[PDB]
Short mmCIF file of N, CA and C in Angstrom, two decimals:
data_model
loop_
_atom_site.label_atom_id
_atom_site.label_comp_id
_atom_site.label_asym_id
_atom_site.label_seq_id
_atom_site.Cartn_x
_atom_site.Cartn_y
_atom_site.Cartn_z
N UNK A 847 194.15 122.99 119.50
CA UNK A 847 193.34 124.14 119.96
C UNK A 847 192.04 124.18 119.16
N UNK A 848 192.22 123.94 117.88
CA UNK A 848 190.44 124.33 116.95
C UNK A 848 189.97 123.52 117.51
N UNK A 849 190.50 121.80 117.53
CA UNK A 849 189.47 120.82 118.10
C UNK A 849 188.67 121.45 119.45
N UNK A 850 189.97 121.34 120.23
CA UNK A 850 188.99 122.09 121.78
C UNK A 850 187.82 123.16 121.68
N UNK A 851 188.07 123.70 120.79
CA UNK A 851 187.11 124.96 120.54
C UNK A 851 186.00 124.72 120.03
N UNK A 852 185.54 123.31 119.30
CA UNK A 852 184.23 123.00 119.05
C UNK A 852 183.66 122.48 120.38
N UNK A 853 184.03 122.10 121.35
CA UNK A 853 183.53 121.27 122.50
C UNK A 853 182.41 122.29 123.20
N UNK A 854 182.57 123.91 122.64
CA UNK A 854 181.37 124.74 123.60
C UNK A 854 180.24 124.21 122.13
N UNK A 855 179.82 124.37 121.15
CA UNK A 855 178.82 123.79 120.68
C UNK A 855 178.14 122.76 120.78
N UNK A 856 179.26 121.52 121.49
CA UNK A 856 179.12 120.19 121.83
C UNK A 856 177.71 120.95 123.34
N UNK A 857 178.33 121.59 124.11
CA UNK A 857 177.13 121.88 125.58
C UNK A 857 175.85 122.07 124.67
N UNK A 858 175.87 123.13 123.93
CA UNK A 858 174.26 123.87 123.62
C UNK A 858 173.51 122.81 123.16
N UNK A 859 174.35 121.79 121.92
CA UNK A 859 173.57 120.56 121.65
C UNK A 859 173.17 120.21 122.53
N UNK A 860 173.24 119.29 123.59
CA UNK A 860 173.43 118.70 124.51
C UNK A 860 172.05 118.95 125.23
N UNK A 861 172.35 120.33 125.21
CA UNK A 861 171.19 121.06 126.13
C UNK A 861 169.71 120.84 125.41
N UNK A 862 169.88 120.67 124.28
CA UNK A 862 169.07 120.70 123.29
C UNK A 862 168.23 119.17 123.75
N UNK A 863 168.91 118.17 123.73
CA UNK A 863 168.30 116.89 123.97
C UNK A 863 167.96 116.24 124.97
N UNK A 864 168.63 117.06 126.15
CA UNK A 864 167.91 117.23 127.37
C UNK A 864 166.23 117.49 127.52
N UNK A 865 166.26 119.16 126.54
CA UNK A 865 164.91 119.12 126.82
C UNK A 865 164.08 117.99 126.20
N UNK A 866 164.48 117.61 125.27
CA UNK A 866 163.68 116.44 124.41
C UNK A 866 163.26 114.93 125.78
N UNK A 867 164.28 114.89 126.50
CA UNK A 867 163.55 113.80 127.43
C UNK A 867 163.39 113.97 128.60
N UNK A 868 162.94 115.54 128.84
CA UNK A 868 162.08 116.12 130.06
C UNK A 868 160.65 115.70 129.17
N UNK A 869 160.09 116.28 128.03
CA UNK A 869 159.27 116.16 127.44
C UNK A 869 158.81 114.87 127.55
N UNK A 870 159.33 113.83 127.00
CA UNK A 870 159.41 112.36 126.99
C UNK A 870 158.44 112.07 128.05
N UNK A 871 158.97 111.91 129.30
CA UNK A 871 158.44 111.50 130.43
C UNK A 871 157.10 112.42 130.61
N UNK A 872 157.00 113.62 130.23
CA UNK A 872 155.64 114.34 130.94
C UNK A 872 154.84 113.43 130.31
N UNK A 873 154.88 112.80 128.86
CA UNK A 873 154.10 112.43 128.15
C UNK A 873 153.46 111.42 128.43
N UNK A 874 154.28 110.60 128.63
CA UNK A 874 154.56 109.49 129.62
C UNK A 874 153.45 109.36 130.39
N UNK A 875 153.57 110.32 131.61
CA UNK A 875 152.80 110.40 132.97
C UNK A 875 151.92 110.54 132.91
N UNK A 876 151.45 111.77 131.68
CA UNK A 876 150.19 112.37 131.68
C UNK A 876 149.24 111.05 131.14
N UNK A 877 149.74 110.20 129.52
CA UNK A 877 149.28 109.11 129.12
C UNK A 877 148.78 107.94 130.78
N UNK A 878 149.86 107.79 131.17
CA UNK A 878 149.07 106.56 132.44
C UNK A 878 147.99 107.70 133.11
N UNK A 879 148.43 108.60 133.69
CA UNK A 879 147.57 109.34 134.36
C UNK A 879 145.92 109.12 134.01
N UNK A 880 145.68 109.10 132.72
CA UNK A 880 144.42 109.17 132.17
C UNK A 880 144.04 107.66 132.35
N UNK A 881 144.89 106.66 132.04
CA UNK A 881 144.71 105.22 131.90
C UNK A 881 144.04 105.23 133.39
N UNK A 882 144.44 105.75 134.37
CA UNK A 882 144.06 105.00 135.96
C UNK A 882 142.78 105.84 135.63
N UNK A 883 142.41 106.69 135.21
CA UNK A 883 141.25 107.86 135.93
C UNK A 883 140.12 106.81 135.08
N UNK A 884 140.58 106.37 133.95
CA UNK A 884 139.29 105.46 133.07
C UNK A 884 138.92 104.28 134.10
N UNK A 885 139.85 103.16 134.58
CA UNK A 885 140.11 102.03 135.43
C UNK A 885 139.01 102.62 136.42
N UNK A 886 139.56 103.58 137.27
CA UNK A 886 138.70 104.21 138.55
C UNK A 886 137.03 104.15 138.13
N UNK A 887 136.72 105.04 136.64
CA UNK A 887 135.46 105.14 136.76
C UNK A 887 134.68 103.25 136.12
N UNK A 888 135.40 102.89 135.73
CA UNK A 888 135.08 101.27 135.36
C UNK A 888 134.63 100.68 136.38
N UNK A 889 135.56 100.66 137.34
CA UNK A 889 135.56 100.07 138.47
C UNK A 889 134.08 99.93 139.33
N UNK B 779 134.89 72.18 156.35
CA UNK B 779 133.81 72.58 155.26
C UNK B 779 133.46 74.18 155.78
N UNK B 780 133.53 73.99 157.55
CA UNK B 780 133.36 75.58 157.82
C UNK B 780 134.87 76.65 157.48
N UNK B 781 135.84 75.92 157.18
CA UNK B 781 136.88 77.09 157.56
C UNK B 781 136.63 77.35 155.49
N UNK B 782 136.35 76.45 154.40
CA UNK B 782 136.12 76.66 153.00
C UNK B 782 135.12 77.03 153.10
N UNK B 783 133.99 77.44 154.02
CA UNK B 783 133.05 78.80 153.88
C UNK B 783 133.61 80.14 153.71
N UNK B 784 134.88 80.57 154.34
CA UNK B 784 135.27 81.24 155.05
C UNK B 784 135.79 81.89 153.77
N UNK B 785 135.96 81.01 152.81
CA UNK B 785 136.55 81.74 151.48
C UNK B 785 136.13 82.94 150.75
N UNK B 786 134.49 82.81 151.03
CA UNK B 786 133.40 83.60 149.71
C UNK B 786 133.90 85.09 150.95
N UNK B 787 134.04 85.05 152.25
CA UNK B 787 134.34 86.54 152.58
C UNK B 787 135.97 87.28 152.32
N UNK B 788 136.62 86.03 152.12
CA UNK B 788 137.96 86.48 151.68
C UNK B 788 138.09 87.22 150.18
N UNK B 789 137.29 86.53 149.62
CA UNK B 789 137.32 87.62 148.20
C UNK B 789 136.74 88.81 148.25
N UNK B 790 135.45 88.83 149.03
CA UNK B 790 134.74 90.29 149.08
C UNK B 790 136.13 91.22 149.53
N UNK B 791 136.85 91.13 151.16
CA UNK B 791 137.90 91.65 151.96
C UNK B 791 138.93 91.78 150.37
N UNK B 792 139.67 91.12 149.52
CA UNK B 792 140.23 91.52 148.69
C UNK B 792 139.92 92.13 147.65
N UNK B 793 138.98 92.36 147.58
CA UNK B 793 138.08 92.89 146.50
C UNK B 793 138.07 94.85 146.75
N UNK B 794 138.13 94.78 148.45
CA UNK B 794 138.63 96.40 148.44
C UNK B 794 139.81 96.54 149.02
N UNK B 795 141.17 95.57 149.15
CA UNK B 795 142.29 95.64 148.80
C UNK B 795 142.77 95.90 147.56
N UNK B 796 141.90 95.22 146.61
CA UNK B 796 142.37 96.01 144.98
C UNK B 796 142.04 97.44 144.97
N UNK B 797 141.21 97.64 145.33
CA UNK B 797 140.68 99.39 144.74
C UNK B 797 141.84 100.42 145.34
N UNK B 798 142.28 100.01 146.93
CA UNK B 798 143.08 100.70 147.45
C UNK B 798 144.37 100.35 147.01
N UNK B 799 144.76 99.70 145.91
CA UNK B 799 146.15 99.09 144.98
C UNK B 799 146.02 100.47 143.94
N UNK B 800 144.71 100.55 143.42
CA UNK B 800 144.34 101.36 142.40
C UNK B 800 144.30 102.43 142.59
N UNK B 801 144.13 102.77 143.75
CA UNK B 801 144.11 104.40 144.17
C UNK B 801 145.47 105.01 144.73
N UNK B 802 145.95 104.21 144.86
CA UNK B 802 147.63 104.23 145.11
C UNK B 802 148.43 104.35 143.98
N UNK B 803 148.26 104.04 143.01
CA UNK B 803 148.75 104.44 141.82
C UNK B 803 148.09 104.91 140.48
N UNK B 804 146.73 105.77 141.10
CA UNK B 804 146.93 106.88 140.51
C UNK B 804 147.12 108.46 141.06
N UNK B 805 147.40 108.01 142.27
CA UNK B 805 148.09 109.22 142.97
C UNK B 805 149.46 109.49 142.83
N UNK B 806 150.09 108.45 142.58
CA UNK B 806 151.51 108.60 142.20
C UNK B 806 151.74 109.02 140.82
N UNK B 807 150.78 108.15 139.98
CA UNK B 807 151.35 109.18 138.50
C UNK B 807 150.71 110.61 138.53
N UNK B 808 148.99 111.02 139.40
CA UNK B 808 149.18 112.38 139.54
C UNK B 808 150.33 113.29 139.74
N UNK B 809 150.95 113.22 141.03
CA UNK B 809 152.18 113.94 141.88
C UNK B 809 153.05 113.92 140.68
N UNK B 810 153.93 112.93 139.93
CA UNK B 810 154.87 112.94 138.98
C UNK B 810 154.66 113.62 138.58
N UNK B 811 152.93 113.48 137.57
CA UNK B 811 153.05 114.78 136.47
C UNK B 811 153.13 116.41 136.19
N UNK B 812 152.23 116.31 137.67
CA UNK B 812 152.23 118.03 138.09
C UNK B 812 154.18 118.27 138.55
N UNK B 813 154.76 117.09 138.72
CA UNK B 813 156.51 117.93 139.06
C UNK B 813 156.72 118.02 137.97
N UNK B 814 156.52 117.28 136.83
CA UNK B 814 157.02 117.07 135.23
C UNK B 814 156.56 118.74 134.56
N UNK B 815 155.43 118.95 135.08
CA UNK B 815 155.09 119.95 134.59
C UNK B 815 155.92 121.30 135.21
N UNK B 816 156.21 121.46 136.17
CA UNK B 816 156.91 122.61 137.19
C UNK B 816 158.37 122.58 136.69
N UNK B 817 158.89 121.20 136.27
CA UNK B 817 160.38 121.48 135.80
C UNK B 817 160.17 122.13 134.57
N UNK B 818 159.26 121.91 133.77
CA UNK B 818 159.29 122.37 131.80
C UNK B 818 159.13 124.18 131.83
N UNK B 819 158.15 124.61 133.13
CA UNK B 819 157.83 125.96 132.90
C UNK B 819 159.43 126.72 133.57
N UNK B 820 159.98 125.96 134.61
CA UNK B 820 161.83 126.25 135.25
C UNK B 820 162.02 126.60 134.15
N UNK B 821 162.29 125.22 133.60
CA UNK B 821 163.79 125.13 132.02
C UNK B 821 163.35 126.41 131.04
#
């Protein structure tokens, strides 16, 4: 039973590192995003 | 010798096949980022 009973702290973590690689990717996108807009005006 | 004339207009014709390669993907990392952004203000 104690064991089982840590497994709800196990979710909130969890939740925690989720948001960390929503973040990830915006960063991501926004970084190329800018890369094409430079290319475009080169071009 | 006439159809290897024919070359110097094939590069111009690919020449705005690239741009429309280029404008194709930076419309796609636009769209991503503005969803990237709409999920972070959700969460």
């Amino acid at each position: 039973r104690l064991l089982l009973e840590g497994i709800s702290s196990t979710h909130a973590h969890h939740l925690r590192c989720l948001n960390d690689f929503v973040e990830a990717q915006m960063t991501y996108y926004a970084q190329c995003y800018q890369y094409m807009l430079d290319l475009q005006k080169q071009l």
